[PDB]
């Protein structure tokens with residue numbers, strides 16, 4: 001089943017820290033590259049995550065960071081996933097050396113859209129979609145990471161709408177004002193993620209604070225067109241930010257729009 005034996009793990013180098021503590025690069029069964037999130041005690045609702053990692057092991061898609069398993073008969077617990085050699089998309093976007101063509105940026109958006117369309121087909125929310133939660137493999141393929149792990153974060157700064165680490169800049173109004181989470185809230189975050197990609201990793205609303213961002217969007221104002229985005233590309237991302245949640249497209253619609261732009265441009 002889902003349970004990896006920790007004897008089958010070697011820890012090689014440190015990849016970074018995030019919400020649940022350290023993440024290490026390693027080998028699984030002396031052959032397979034893996035990332036290993038070592039879960040900082042106190043950071044996670046471990047029993048709920050364990051009980052729900054089963055559902056998560058059934059989420060398998062070409063554009064989702066593949067879960068390989070868990071080590072849960074120990075503390076701290078580990079979570080083993082597919083290794084993504086090119087690391088965080090946000091950093092990737094930020095290195096001027098890649099000198100991306102707009103076609104490669106759109107492929108990045110398509111990668112994430114495929115993953116999210118699959119998630120939507122399973123009626124499973126990400127809740128924290130953003131470039132910082134996307135990874136890049138050795139072939140330049142973008143995959144969506146840590147989908148659904150937000151529910152097991154014990155830090156109130158991250159989970160409360162008013163917390164200092166809440167993804168205010170990726171959230172629709174109805175999340176900020178009413179904690180109304182839905183497939184349409186992931187759609188909103190998706191459009192902001194496209195803006196992140198087309199602006200080569202800028203902070204959304206770069207000149208605003210979080211509070212200023214919430215007022216801006218409640219006044220009905222949105223992110224400006226990144227220079228690199230064509231009118232077609234802007235229309236896609238802007239469609240994700242309709243004030244009425246029910247007028248935002250599905251990931252299935254967004255996918256067919258992205259493929260069309262690819263064909264057209």
Ligand SMILES: CS(=O)(=O)c1ccc(C(=O)Nc2cccc(-c3cn4ccnc4c(Nc4ccc(C(=O)N5CCOCC5)cc4)n3)c2)cc1
Pocket residue numbers: 014015016017018023034035065081082083084085086087088091135
């Ligand atoms: C703000 S900053 O200092 O530029 C900065 C911000 C974030 C990171 C970062 O990698 N964070 C992070 C946090 C949790 C999990 C993960 C993380 C999770 N993963 C799941 C699957 N694969 C990965 C993966 N792959 C990586 C990450 C980083 C590198 C890398 O080249 N590094 C350079 C040398 O030092 C180690 C990293 C290589 C592969 N990184 C990544 C590194 C630097």
